[PDB]
Design a protein around this nucleic acid. Structure first.
Ligand code: GTP
Ligand code: MG
Lengths: 159, 232, 54, 92, 293, 96, 88, 74
RNA sequence: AGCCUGAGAAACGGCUACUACAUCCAAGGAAGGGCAGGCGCGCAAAUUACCCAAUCCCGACACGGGGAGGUAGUGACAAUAAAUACUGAUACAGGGCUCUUUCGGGUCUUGUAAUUGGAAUGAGUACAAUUUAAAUCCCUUAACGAGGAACAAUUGGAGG
C-alpha cells in the first residue's frame, strides 16, 4: 500500500536507515512495549500490579531517554513513537551533536570506527544510546580527528 | 563418578570444578558425611590448584590427619578430625555452621592435641575385655566403666587414651549432625523415649527456638564447656 | 573473581552451555532493547500481586 | 612494561610463590612472556631459570594484560613441580 | 497430508527416463580417470592409490592400471596427460572422474575445460573433486577460506553438494595414507553406471597392452611400412561383431579388425572365480598393469 | 496433477517447431509425456531462445503455469537436472 | 507405475537376449553374438602407420571405438551449434 | 607458467542485464530516491524553507497571481 | 544345555557336547563367530579430525593406562549485527516536477557521460607477540591495502 510505502520511506530518508528491515525491527519493539502498556491500562488504577509494573516501565523508558522526563504517564507511554526511537538511535545522535555534516556521514563514521561511546569504540550504528550515555560521544583517540596518526591518505601524500 | 551437582551440597564446589566431582574413598566416616582430602586442600583451602599438585603434596609426608600421615588423595575426613599441616604449622578442624555446611577452623597445638569423639557403642571384646566404639571407627580397649552409648570422649590423639568423658544429659548443650534441623547448636532440654524405635530429643537453642532431633543425629559437645574452639 | 581466585584460565563457553543459554533465551519472555531489561507481564506481575496481598 | 602485583601468596608446602601480575604495555604489542620472566626474575630478586608465567590474557582496548607468574625457590623445584607442557613452553 | 506431499515430491524426484542398461553379469572394470592441470601430481595420486590397493610401490606407473576392489566389481585407473587430445578421448570414455585442483593456486583452465567437455559429451557416473597442495598454506584462516570458496565455485560448476576431498601433505612422496583411505572408502562401494546412450550403443575398449607384430624381413625391406598391431584390453560397451568390424583408434584413423582372440582375464574377480562374507583377502587383492612396472 | 507439485516427463516432440512468428504460443509449446502416469500433456518453454535449448528425449521437469492458446497448464522449469532459466541465461552447461 | 513398467520391459528384453543365445557355442556365441563385453581380448589390426609405431609413447592412451555403418558414411551434417559462454 | 582462470568464470555472471551503482548500494538508492521524492514535494505543496532571508524582504520572488484561491473550503 | 574364577557374575569372559554357519590345507588335519561406515533409483549434499591438556577412574604404584571429557572443522535451515562509499569548489545549461477536470491547471531552483579538490578507510595482505596439550578463534599489533576499465549486489515485475 502507498501509505505504508511512503511512510517507511519518509522515516528512512529523514533518518537514513539502510532498509525497511531495520524500520520493521524498530516497529516490532515499539509494538511490544506499547502492548505491555495496553495490558497495564487494562488493569485498574491503584492496583499494586499496575502501579509497580507501570512505574518500572516508565523508569526504563526515561532512563534510556525516549519518554520525556516531564510526562510520566501510561497514556504517553502509548503515545511513544518509532520516530522517538529513531531519534534515540546512535547515528542520528552523531548527526545531531554535530560531529558529522550529514546523517550518511555519521553512518560511515560509525562504520569505520571513529566515534566512541564512553571508553570503547562502537562499530554499529543501531546502538540505542541511553540518556546517561548521550553526553560522552566523541572521536576516538586513534582516529585522525581525535589525534593519533595523521592517517592513510595523509601518509601517502606526505610520502 | 557422580556429577558435581549430585555431589553433597555441604562440601562446596563452585561452578567451575567441571561436570564431575570426586567420590570419597572407603574409610572411617560415612559417604554422605565426608570431606575428602583433595577437596579440603584445593577447593576449600586452595593450598594447591590441580589434581597432580595435590597428588605431589599428599605424596610427600606433608599432610597429617588425626596425628597420622595420610598418603592417598581421597582419604575421607568427615567430622572433627584435626588436620595438622606442619609447613604452615596450622591445624584445621571441621565443624558445621547454622546452615549446615563444612566450616574449617584454625587451631594451634594445645587444643589441636586432642579430639572429641562421640561413642557409637560398647561391648566385650575377645578375651573378655570391654571395648569402646567411637563414631570415628576408633576402638578403645579397657575404657572407663561409666561410658555408655551416646557419651562423648576427649581423646589424647597421641596415645589414644581416654582423657575425659561427657555424659548425655538433659540440660546440656549439643550440636546436631543430621536431620532437617542439621547444624543448630543448642541445649538439650528434653528426652522422649518412644520405646520401639527412634527415640527423640527436644532441643532448644540459647535463644528460644524448639525443635525435635533424633538421638542418632545428636552429637554432644558439652554442657556449657565448649571444649572445641567454635568460630566467633 | 573465580579466574583470579586460583588463577586458572577458563575455557571460553562450550557448545553445551551455549546451547543451553540459547534455548533459555528462546523460551524466555525478556528483551534487551537498550541497557535495561524488559520482562513479560505474567507470573512476575502475579508474584507482585500475591506478595502485596500477603 | 609497567608492572603491578596483586594477590601474592607464598605457597610454602609447594615451595612456590603465586601472584597475579598486572603488566601494562602502552603503545607496544604484547609482552613476550620470555621477557616477562626475565623481568620478574630481578623484580623479585630470583633467577630466570626459576620463574615461569602463563595465563596472560590481553585486556580489551589494549594496555592492560593479566598474567599469572610463579617463582620457585629452586630451579630443581621448578623442574619437579612444573607440568610438562609449561616446562616445554619455558624451554627446559 | 504433508507426509503425502513429501512422499509425492520424493517420488517425482525419483523418476527418470527409461534408458537401456546393457551391462553384462561379468562386468568390465569401471574407468576411473585422474584429470588435472600440469604439475598437480595425478601420477602421485595414481601411485598412492595403487599402493593402498595392491601394496605395490610402482616407480613409474603409466597407461591403464587395473585393480580389483570388491569381490564383485573392479576398477582401472588412467591418468590423463597434459594434452587436450587425450583429455577429450578419456572424457568421452570415462565413468568416474577424479578432478584434481591445485589448492592455493585456485582453479585452472584445464579443470574448467575438462568439466565443460565432460558435461557436453556425457555426464558420467561419479565425479569427485580432490584438492591438493594444502601444505602450501601459512594461515589456516586463509586455508579454510580458500577451501570454502573453492567448494562453492565447484558446486556451481557441476552440482549442489558434490564430494570434495582434501589432501594435505606429501609424507613419503606418496600421500597421507589415512586421507587416501577415506578416499578409497568413498570410491569402493559403487553403483551401476549411468546408462548413457552412446556407450550403450557403441562397443569400445581401452588398450591395456600394445605390441608390434612385424616380420623383421619386412622391417628391413621397408622401414616405413604397414605394421600389424596386437592390442590387448577389455571389451566394454556392447558386443563386437564377429568379423569385419570397423574400428577408429583415437588419434590414428579408421581401420578394420583382422583378428579377435577372446581370452580370460588376468584380474579374475573371486565372484567370477567361484562361478557371503565381506572382507577381501590377500589372495584376492590383485593387479594388472602390462605397461607400467 | 497427481498429488505433487513438479512432475517429470520426457519430451516427445517439439510440436509447432515450424511456426513462422517467433514468440507464438504454438511455437513455444512442447508435447511431453508425464512419467508418473505415462500421460501425454503439453507444456510451454518460456522463450523460443530456450526452445533451442530443450532437446528431444530429455528428463524434463515441469510445474504449473499461473497467470494465445489459453488452457496450457504446465511450464518447463528444469531440463536434464539443470534450471532452465540458468540455461537460458548461460550460467550452466546442459549435462547430456 | 509407468516408469517401473518401462524398465521391466527393458529387463525382459535384456533377458530374452542371452536367453535366446544361451544355446550353442560356435554358431551362436562365437558367430552370432560376436565377442561379449567384459571378456579380455587381443585385437590384430593390419596396416597401422609406422610413424605411429615409432612415435608411440606409453603415456598417451589408446582408445578403440566401434565404427558403425552410419559412422562410415560421408555427407553433409546439418547441426545445431552455439558458441561457448566463456569463449572470447 | 600456468593458465590463470579469468574473472568471468571465477564468478559466473552470464547474461544478467545491466544495473546502476545506485542499485548496487542499497543505502544510496534510498538516499537518492528520498531526495528526489523530497524535490517532488516542493513542487506540489510548499515547504517553509526558512523565513525571510537575512538580506530583508526582496518581494514575493516568484509571481503573484490574482485569480487563484487556495483555501480549503469548509 | 552344563561347568569354571572371584568379596561381588549363573560374567557371555571363557571351556565342554549337540545344532546352524563360515575360513585355511600339502586333504591326514586346524582355528572361528561383535560394532561403526557407504549404497539402498541411473541423480548426490554436516568430519574416516586433535589430545588426556583440565574434572574423574584403575592398578605393586608420585611416573603406567582410560572410547567419559574438552579442543577443532562444515551451515543461507534459521536467527543476530551491517560494508559495497563520505564531503567540497568551479563551469555550463533552463527547465525539473505535478493533477480532479488534460489541446486545461499548479509550483520554483534543478541537472550534467562537465572540470578539479579534499579527507576517511575495512574486506584483504600480514611481520610478530599472545592463546593453547599443539594449534586455531578472541584480545593486542608494526607494515601495506580505493578511483569505476574497479576491492566487479542480486532477484523479480512493468515500459519505451
Ligand atoms: N608440498 C606438496 N607437493 C606436492 C603436492 N602435490 C604434488 N606435489 C609435488 O608436485 C609434483 C607434481 O608431480 P605429479 O603429481 O607427478 O605431476 P603429474 O601431472 O602427476 O605428472 P607430470 O606429467 O610429470 O606432471 C610431485 O612430484 C610432488 O613432489 C602437494 O600436495 N603438496
Ligand atoms: Mg600421469
Amino acid at each position: 500500500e502507498a501509505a505504508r510505502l511512503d511512510s517507511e520511506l519518509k522515516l528512512v530518508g529523514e533518518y537514513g536507515l539502510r532498509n525497511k528491515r531495520e524500520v520493521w525491527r524498530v516497529l516490532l519493539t515499539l509494538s511490544k512495549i506499547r502492548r505491555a502498556a495496553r495490558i497495564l491500562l487494562t488493569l485498574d488504577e491503584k492496583d499494586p500490579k499496575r502501579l509497580f509494573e507501570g512505574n518500572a516501565l516508565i523508569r526504563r523508558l526515561v532512563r534510556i531517554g525516549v519518554l520525556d522526563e516531564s510526562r510520566m504517564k501510561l497514556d504517553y507511554v502509548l503515545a511513544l513513537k518509532a520516530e522517538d526511537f529513531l531519534e534515540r538511535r546512535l547515528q542520528t545522535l552523531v548527526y545531531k551533536l554535530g560531529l558529522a555534516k550529514s546523517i550518511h556521514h555519521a553512518r560511515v563514521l560509525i562504520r569505520q570506527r571513529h566515534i566512541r561511546v564512553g571508553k570503547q569504540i562502537v562499530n554499529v550504528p543501531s546502538f540505542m544510546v541511553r540518556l546517561d550515555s548521550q553526553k560522552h560521544i566523541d572521536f576516538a583517540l586513534t582516529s585522525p580527528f581525535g589525534g593519533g596518526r595523521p592517517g592513510r591518505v595523509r601518509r601517502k601524500k606526505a610520502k | 563418578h557422580q556429577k558435581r551437582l549430585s555431589a553433597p551440597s555441604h562440601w562446596l564446589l563452585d561452578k567451575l570444578s567441571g561436570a564431575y566431582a570426586p567420590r570419597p574413598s572407603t574409610g572411617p566416616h560415612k559417604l554422605r558425611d565426608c570431606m575428602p582430602l583433595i577437596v579440603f586442600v584445593r577447593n576449600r583451602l586452595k593450598y594447591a590448584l590441580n589434581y597432580r599438585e595435590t597428588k605431589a603434596i599428599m605424596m610427600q609426608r606433608l599432610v597429617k590427619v588425626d596425628g597420622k600421615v595420610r598418603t592417598d588423595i581421597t582419604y575421607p575426613a568427615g567430622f572433627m578430625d584435626v588436620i595438622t599441616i606442619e609447613k604452615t604449622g596450622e591445624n584445621f578442624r571441621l565443624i558445621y555452621d547454622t546452615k549446615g555446611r563444612f566450616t574449617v577452623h584454625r587451631i594451634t597445638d594445645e587444643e589441636a592435641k586432642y579430639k572429641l569423639g562421640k561413642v557409637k557403642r560398647v561391648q566385650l571384646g575377645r578375651g573378655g575385655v570391654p571395648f569402646l566404639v567411637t563414631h570415628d571407627a576408633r576402638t578403645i580397649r579397657y575404657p572407663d566403666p561409666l561410658i555408655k552409648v551416646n557419651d562423648t570422649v576427649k581423646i589424647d590423639l597421641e596415645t589414644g587414651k581416654i582423657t575425659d568423658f561427657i555424659k548425655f544429659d538433659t540440660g546440656a548443650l549439643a550440636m546436631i549432625t543430621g536431620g532437617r534441623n542439621m547444624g543448630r547448636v543448642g541445649v538439650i532440654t528434653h528426652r522422649e523415649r518412644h520405646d520401639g524405635g527412634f527415640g527423640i530429643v527436644h532441643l532448644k537453642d540459647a535463644l528460644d527456638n524448639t525443635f525435635a532431633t533424633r538421638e542418632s543425629n545428636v552429637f554432644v559437645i558439652g554442657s556449657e564447656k565448649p571444649w572445641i574452639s567454635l568460630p566467633k | 573473581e573465580y579466574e583470579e581466585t586460583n588463577f586458572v584460565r577458563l575455557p571460553k563457553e562450550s557448545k553445551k552451555e551455549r546451547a543451553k543459554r540459547a534455548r533459555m533465551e528462546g523460551r524466555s519472555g525478556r528483551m534487551n532493547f537498550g541497557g535495561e531489561e524488559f520482562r513479560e507481564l505474567g507470573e512476575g506481575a502475579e508474584r507482585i500481586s500475591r506478595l502485596t496481598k500477603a | 612494561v609497567t608492572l603491578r602485583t596483586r594477590k601474592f601468596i607464598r605457597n610454602p608446602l609447594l615451595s612456590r610463590k603465586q601472584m597475579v601480575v598486572d603488566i601494562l604495555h602502552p603503545g607496544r604489542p604484547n609482552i613476550s612472556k620470555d621477557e616477562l620472566r626475565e623481568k620478574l626474575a630481578t623484580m623479585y630478586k630470583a633467577q630466570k631459570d626459576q620463574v615461569s608465567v602463563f595465563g596472560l590474557r590481553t585486556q580489551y582496548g589494549g594496555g592492560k594484560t593479566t598474567g599469572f607468574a610463579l617463582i620457585y625457590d629452586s630451579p630443581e623445584a621448578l623442574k619437579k613441580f612444573e607440568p610438562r607442557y609449561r616446562l616445554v613452553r619455558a624451554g627446559l | 497430508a504433508r507426509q503425502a506431499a513429501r512422499s509425492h515430491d520424493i517420488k517425482e524426484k525419483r523418476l527418470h527416463v527409461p534408458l537401456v542398461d546393457r551391462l553384462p553379469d561379468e562386468p568390465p572394470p569401471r574407468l576411473v580417470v585422474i584429470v588435472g592441470p600440469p604439475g598437480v601430481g595425478k601420477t602421485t595420486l595414481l601411485k598412492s592409490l595403487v599402493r593402498r590397493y595392491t601394496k605395490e610401490t610402482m616407480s613409474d606407473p603409466v597407461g591403464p592400471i587395473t585393480v580389483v576392489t570388491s569381490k564383485k566389481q573392479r576398477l582401472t585407473f588412467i591418468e590423463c596427460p597434459n594434452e587436450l587430445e587425450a583429455m577429450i578421448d578419456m572424457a568421452k570414455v570415462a565413468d568416474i572422474v577424479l578432478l584434481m585442483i591445485d589448492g592455493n593456486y585456485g582453479f585452472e583452465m584445464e579443470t574448467m575445460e575438462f568439466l565443460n567437455i565432460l558435461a557436453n559429451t556425457g555426464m558420467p557416473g561419479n565425479v569427485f573433486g580432490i584438492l591438493t597442495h594444502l601444505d602450501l598454506f601459512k594461515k589456516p584462516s586463509a586455508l579454510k577460506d580458500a577451501k570454502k570458496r573453492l567448494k562453492h565455485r565447484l558446486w556451481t560448476e557441476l552440482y549442489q553438494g558434490a564430494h570434495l576431498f582434501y589432501l594435505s601433505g606429501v609424507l613419503n612422496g606418496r600421500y597421507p595414507d589415512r586421507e587416501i583411505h577415506n578416499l578409497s572408502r568413498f570410491l569402493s562401494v559403487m553403483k551401476n553406471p549411468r546408462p548413457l546412450v552412446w556407450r550403450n550403443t557403441h562397443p569400445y575398449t581401452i588398450i591395456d597392452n600394445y605390441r608390434d607384430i612385424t616380420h623383421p624381413t619386412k622391417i628391413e625391406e621397408d622401414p616405413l611400412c604397414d605394421r600389424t598391431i596386437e592390442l590387448s584390453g577389455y571389451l566394454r560397451g556392447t558386443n563386437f561383431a564377429a568379423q569385419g568390424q570397423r574400428v577408429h583408434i583415437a588419434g590414428v584413423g579408421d581401420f578394420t579388425i583382422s583378428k579377435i582372440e577372446e581370452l580370460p582375464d588376468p584380474c579374475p574377480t573371486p565372484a567370477m572365480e567361484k562361478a557371503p562374507r565381506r572382507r577381501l583377502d590377500e589372495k584376492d587383492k590383485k593387479l594388472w598393469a602390462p605397461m607400467a612396472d | 496433477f497427481g498429488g505433487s507439485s513438479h512432475a517429470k516427463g520426457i519430451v516427445l516432440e517439439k510440436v509447432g517447431v515450424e511456426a513462422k512468428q517467433p514468440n507464438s504460443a504454438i511455437r513455444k509449446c512442447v508435447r511431453v509425456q508425464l512419467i508418473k502416469n505415462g500421460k501425454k500433456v503439453t507444456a510451454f518453454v518460456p522463450n523460443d531462445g530456450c526452445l533451442n535449448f530443450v532437446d528431444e528425449n530429455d528428463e524434463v521437469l515441469l510445474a504449473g503455469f499461473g497467470r494465445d492458446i489459453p488452457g496450457v497448464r504446465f511450464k518447463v522449469v528444469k531440463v536434464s537436472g539443470v534450471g532452465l532459466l540458468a540455461l537460458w541465461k548461460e550460467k550452466k552447461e546442459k549435462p547430456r | 507405475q509407468w516408469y517401473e513398467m518401462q524398465k521391466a520391459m527393458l529387463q525382459k528384453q535384456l533377458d530374452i537376449n542371452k536367453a535366446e543365445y544361451a544355446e550353442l557355442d560356435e554358431h551362436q556365441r562365437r558367430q552370432v553374438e560376436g565377442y561379449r563385453a567384459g571378456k579380455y581380448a587381443r585385437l590384430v589390426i593390419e596396416g597401422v602407420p609406422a610413424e605411429f609405431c615409432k612415435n608411440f609413447q606409453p603415456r598417451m592412451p589408446i582408445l578403440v571405438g566401434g565404427l558403425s555403418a552410419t559412422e562410415d558414411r560421408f555427407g553433409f551434417v546439418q547441426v545445431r551449434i552455439k558458441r561457448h559462454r566463456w569463449h572470447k | 607458467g600456468k593458465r590463470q582462470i579469468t574473472w568471468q568464470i571465477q564468478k559466473n555472471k552470464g547474461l544478467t542485464p545491466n544495473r546502476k551503482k545506485e542499485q548496487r548500494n542499497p543505502r544510496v538508492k534510498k538516499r537518492k530516491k528520498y531526495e528526489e521524492k523530497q524535490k517532488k514535494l516542493r513542487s506540489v505543496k510548499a515547504v517553509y524553507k526558512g523565513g525571510e532571508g537575512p538580506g530583508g524582504y526582496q518581494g514575493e520572488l516568484s509571481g503573484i497571481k490574482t485569480n487563484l484561491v487556495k483555501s480549503v473550503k469548509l
